[PDB]
Amino acid sequence: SPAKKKVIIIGAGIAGLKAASTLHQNGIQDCLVLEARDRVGGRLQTVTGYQGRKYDIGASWHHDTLTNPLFLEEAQLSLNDGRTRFVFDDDNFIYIDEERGRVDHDKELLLEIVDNEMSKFAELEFHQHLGVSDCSFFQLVMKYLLQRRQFLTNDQIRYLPQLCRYLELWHGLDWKLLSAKDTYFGHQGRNAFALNYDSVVQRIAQSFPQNWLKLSCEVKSITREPSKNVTVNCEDGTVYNADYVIITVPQSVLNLSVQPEKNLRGRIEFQPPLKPVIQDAFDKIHFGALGKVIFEFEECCWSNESSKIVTLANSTNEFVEIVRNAENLDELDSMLERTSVTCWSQPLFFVNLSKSTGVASFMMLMQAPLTNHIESIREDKERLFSFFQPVLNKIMKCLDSEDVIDGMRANKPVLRNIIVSNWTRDPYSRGAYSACFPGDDPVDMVVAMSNGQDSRIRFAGEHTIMDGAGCAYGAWESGRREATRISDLLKLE
Amino acid sequence: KKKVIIIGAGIAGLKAASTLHQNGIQDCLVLEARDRVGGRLQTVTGYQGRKYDIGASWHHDTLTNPLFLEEAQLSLNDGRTRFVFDDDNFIYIDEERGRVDHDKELLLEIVDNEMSKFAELEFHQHLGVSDCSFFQLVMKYLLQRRQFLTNDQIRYLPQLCRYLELWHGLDWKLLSAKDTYFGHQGRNAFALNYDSVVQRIAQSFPQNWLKLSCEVKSITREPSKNVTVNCEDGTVYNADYVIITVPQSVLNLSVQPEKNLRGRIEFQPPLKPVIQDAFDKIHFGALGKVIFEFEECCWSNESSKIVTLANSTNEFVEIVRNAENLDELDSMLERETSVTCWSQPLFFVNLSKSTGVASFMMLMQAPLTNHIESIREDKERLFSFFQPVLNKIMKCLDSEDVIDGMRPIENIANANKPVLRNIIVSNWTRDPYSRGAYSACFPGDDPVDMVVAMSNGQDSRIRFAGEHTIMDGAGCAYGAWESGRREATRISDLLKLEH
Ligand SMILES: Cc1cc2nc3c(=O)[nH]c(=O)nc-3n(C[C@H](O)[C@H](O)[C@H](O)COP(=O)(O)OP(=O)(O)OC[C@H]3O[C@@H](n4cnc5c(N)ncnc54)[C@H](O)[C@@H]3O)c2cc1C
Ligand SMILES: Cc1cc2nc3c(=O)[nH]c(=O)nc-3n(C[C@H](O)[C@H](O)[C@H](O)COP(=O)(O)OP(=O)(O)OC[C@H]3O[C@@H](n4cnc5c(N)ncnc54)[C@H](O)[C@@H]3O)c2cc1C
Ligand SMILES: CC(=O)N[C@@H](C)CCNCCCCN
Ligand SMILES: CC(=O)N[C@@H](C)CCNCCCCN
C-alpha cells in the first residue's frame, strides 16, 4: 500500500523547493514535496492589496548581495533578459523622535558616528575575549554608555540607545530579549529588494515535476524502519515509503516534536524520537517574531528623500541623569525603575516604497513582543489605524506633508488599506525565523540539524546552516546541500 | 658614563626617558638632532597667535588608545580641555557638480561601504595572494559590480573612496590595497595642543638628560658588554643600553652607503639581515599639511570635515561599461599633464566648527606633498594653486570667493568675504630628520617584518622604539609612545633586579 519514493521532502518553502529542484536536476525521480498550506513558498509569500498592489509579507530582501548565491543567480537572469527582478534600495536612514523630529545626519547629535563607535565597542568586547558572558543587547548598550559617558553629550546618551535599536528589526526581537553576542552581524554587501520574491518561488518550483507537489497535505509522523526505509503519514490518511526524507519545517514547528501531545497542527511524531543532541539544541536557540504592517495610501504626497525611515521610541532626560550619576552597571540597573504600550514604545522601521518602487505605500517592520500583539488584532483595521496614527503623522510631518486621513472605506495622505502579517498565529510558521536569546549557541542547532536524525532522515531550512542563517538564501543553500548528498548517495549502486 | 642612551626626542624617546626615570633609573641621556623636542609632533604659531599641529593632530582609536586615556584621566581630574572629538559627517565637493555627499540619488557612502566589504572579502583568508594597488582594487570592484552601480556611482565613487589616501599620505596607485583599510577603533579626538602632551612627558625626567642639536653619527656595539655612541660634534658617550628612536626613513639610511647623509647612523656591527630585509617590505608615506588662516569665519559651519574630489569623466564610465575583462580595463585606461588642486583629493578640516578658529587644516598626500612643501615660502604661488578649490568650498558653504589678504593692506568693503591672512605649510618630506610623515605600505609590503625586526632589537643592548616598531598604533602617536615604554621597561628591569 505505501507507495515507494526515492525522496520525500516535507515543506514547500524555499529550502524544500530548492531541494526538489536539485534532486530533479541530478536525475532523481519519484520524489514528493508535501506541503501543509494551500500554497508553496512558506515564509516567502506575496500578497495582494489596494488596487492589485503587491507586497512581500514574508521575506523582502536579498541580503549579502556580494556573496548571496541565490541573489547572484537571480542577477544573472536579469543580465540575460533585462528584466527587473529586484532593486537596490539601501538609502540614508531618516530617524525620527516624537518631539525632537528628524535626528539623522545631525551636525550636533552625530548619532550615526557614535553608533559606529558602539558597534566597534561590542566587537572589541566579544572578539578575542573568550569566556565573556552573554547578556542582552540592552545591557551591552548600557555598558557602552557607562564606559564612554565622559565622551558623549547628554543628547547623545539620550538618543543613541534608541537609534541603535533599529537592530531589533533585524532579529525580530526587543533589545532586552536579544543576545548581545548575536546582535551585530557582518552584512556582506548592499541589500536588494526583491520585486516579487514569489517570482523566485515560482521559478524554482517550476524547475521540477509538477505532480511532485502535494499541497494541503500535513505530515503528522515519520518513522525509521529497521529495514533501511522511511515511512511518512499525511493527516489525510495516506502513507508513504521513502529511502530519504528532508524535513524543512520551521525550527518552531519542529520543536513541537520534543513534547508530548501530538494533536498540534504541524507537529511531526518521530519514531524513534529525535536524538538527544537535537532535542537539547532547542534549549540553546530560539525564535524571533519579525512582523509586517502595510500602509496603502491613495497616492504619494510626501517627500521621497529616502526609502528608509526609522521612528525612535520615546527617551527621557531622566535617563541621561541616571547614566550621569550611576556608579556602575549594578547601580544603573537599580536606578532604572523610573505605563502602557504605544507606537512609541519601541522603534519601528518603515520602507517608503514610493521612492524605491513608485508605490504610494509604507512597508513597516515590527518586532517581538509588539508583533505578537499587533498580529493578534490584525483584523480590527480601525484599532490598527488608531495605534499607528501618531507615528504615521509624525512621519508625514518630517516628510513635509500633513496628517493621515482614514480612507479605508486633495493634498493630504489618504490611507486606503492596512495589511498585517500573521506568522505568529499560523501553526505552520509559529514566528518569523531563528534568533538568539542571551546565552544561546546557534551553532548547536546548525550542527545537530546538518548531521541529521540518521543517514536517512535529514533536515534543511534557514535554521540548519551557518552562512545565511535565518535568510532566504541560507534556507536555499541547505536545500541544495541535503539534496546533493542524497543525489550522490543514490548514484552509488 | 651613562646607563641608557636614548636617541631621538620624539614622543617615543620622551616616553622611554619618562619611564626610565619613573623606575628610579638615573644617569641617562636623550640625544636629539633638532633644536627642539617633539619630533613629528610640532605645534606652530600663526596669525593672531593661533596654534596648529603641523605634525600629528588626532588621538586615534580612542576606545583603546592608552595615551589618549591617560590624557582623558588628566582632564576628568582638572577639567582642562586637552582635546575635542571632531569626527563629523563628511562634505564631499566636486568641481563641476558641487556637493555629492548624503546624496539621495548618488548614495556614495553606501557603495563606498560595500566597496570596503568587497576589499575585506578579497583578502580575507587567502594569504597574501597577489597584493595590488588600492587603485587596482577599486577598478576590480567597479568591473565586478557595475551591473549594480549607476553611471554616476562608477564615476564619483572611486574619487570619494580616495579620502583613504589622506590616511596613509599616499596616492592610490602607490598604496598597497592589502593595507588600505584600517580598524578605526572608535572616534578620533583632535588634540588641542599635542605640544602639551610633549611638554608633559619632557618635564617628567631630569632636564639635564636632554641634549639638543646632537646628531648621532654612529653606534658601536663593543662585544665587551657595552655600547659606544658619539654625536657628530665629536663628543662620545658610553652606555650599556641604547634605545634608537630615529624614524624608519632615517634608519633606512644605515643600510645604504655614503654615511655622509644627514641624520644617518653608521652601525658597527652593521644591522643584521633581518633588520635590513625589513626595509624592503615596508616604506614611508608623505602626509603633508597646509594651514589656510582667515581673518574671521564667514562661511557655514555645517561640518568640520570637508573633502574636495579630484576631477572625473563620463569618459571613465564608458570604459568600465565596455571593458570585457580586467586586462582590457588596464589598456582602455592606460590609453585613456599639469598638476593642479583638482588633480587629487584634498582633505580640509574646518577648524571653525571644531575649535572656533577661522582656519582650514588641509591634508595632502604624495606625490603632491613634496611639490607643495617645496614651494612653502612662495605664498603667492601657494594661493594661486589652491585658490579654485578654496573658492569651490566657500561657494558650497554659502560664502564668496577668497580675497588674498596676506600682504598688509586694508579695505572696508570686504566683511562678507573670506580674507586669507596667512598660509602655513609643513616640511616633513624635506626635513632631513623625518624624511616623510610615517610608516606606510606600497603594494607587496608587509609591516609585521619591520615590527618584529625592530621589537627584537639588534641585540640585548641596541634596541628600537618609534611608530614603526610596534603593531598596535602603527604609525600613530600612541604607537610610538608605547614602543617607548616597552624598550624602557625591559631595560629598566634588567637593571633594577641587578643590585
Ligand atoms: C516577516 C519575515 C521577514 C523576513 N525577511 C527576510 C528578508 O528580507 N531576507 C531574507 O533572506 N530572509 C527573510 N526572512 C526569513 C526567510 O523568509 C526565511 O529564512 C525563509 O523563508 C525560510 O525558508 P524555509 O524553507 O527554511 O522555511 P519555510 O519557508 O517556513 O518552509 C517550510 C514549510 O514547511 C511547511 N510545513 C510546516 N509543517 C508542516 C507539516 N507538518 N507538514 C507539511 N508541511 C509543513 C510550512 O508550511 C512551510 O511551507 C524573513 C522572514 C519573515 C517571517
Ligand atoms: C603630517 C603628519 C600628520 C600626522 N597625524 C597624526 C595623527 O593625527 N595622529 C597620530 O596618532 N599620529 C599622526 N602622525 C604620526 C605621528 O606624528 C608619529 O607616529 C609620531 O610623531 C612618531 O614619533 P616617534 O618618536 O616614533 O618619531 P619622531 O617624532 O620622528 O622622533 C624621532 C626623533 O629622532 C630625531 N633624530 C633623527 N635622527 C637623529 C640623529 N641622527 N641623532 C639624534 N636625533 C635624531 C628626530 O629629530 C626626531 O626628533 C602624523 C605624522 C605626520 C608627519
Ligand atoms: C539572522 C537575522 O537576524 N535575520 C535574518 C534571518 C533576516 C533579516 N532580514 C529581514 C529584513 C529585516 C530588515 N533588517
Ligand atoms: C605602518 C602603517 O601602516 N601605519 C601608517 C601607514 C598609518 C598611520 N596612520 C596615522 C595617520 C593619522 C592622520 N591622518
Curated annotation (Swiss-Prot), chain B:
One term of GO molecular function: oxidoreductase activity
Entry annotated with the keyword Flavoprotein: yes
Disulfide bonds: none
Organism: Saccharomyces cerevisiae (strain ATCC 204508 / S288c)
SUPFAM superfamilies in alphabetical order: FAD-linked reductases, C-terminal domain, FAD/NAD(P)-binding domain
Gene3D superfamilies the record matches: 3.90.660.10, FAD/NAD(P)-binding domain (3.50.50.60)
Keywords noted in UniProt: FAD, Flavoprotein, Oxidoreductase
EC number(s) on file: 1.5.3.17
Catalyzed reactions: spermine + O2 + H2O = 3-aminopropanal + spermidine + H2O2; spermidine + O2 + H2O = 3-aminopropanal + putrescine + H2O2; N(1)-acetylspermine + O2 + H2O = 3-acetamidopropanal + spermidine + H2O2; N(1)-acetylspermidine + O2 + H2O = 3-acetamidopropanal + putrescine + H2O2
Obligatory cofactor(s): FAD
Misc: Present with 6960 molecules/cell in log phase SD medium.
Enzyme class: oxidoreductase
Any one of the GO BP annotations: spermine catabolic process
Entry similarity comment: Belongs to the flavin monoamine oxidase family.
Function description: Involved in the production of beta-alanine, a precursor of pantothenic acid. Multicopy suppressor of fenpropimorph resistance.
Presence of keyword Flavoprotein: yes
Cofactor comment: Binds 1 FAD per subunit.
Protein name listed in UniProt: Polyamine oxidase FMS1
GO cellular component: cytoplasm
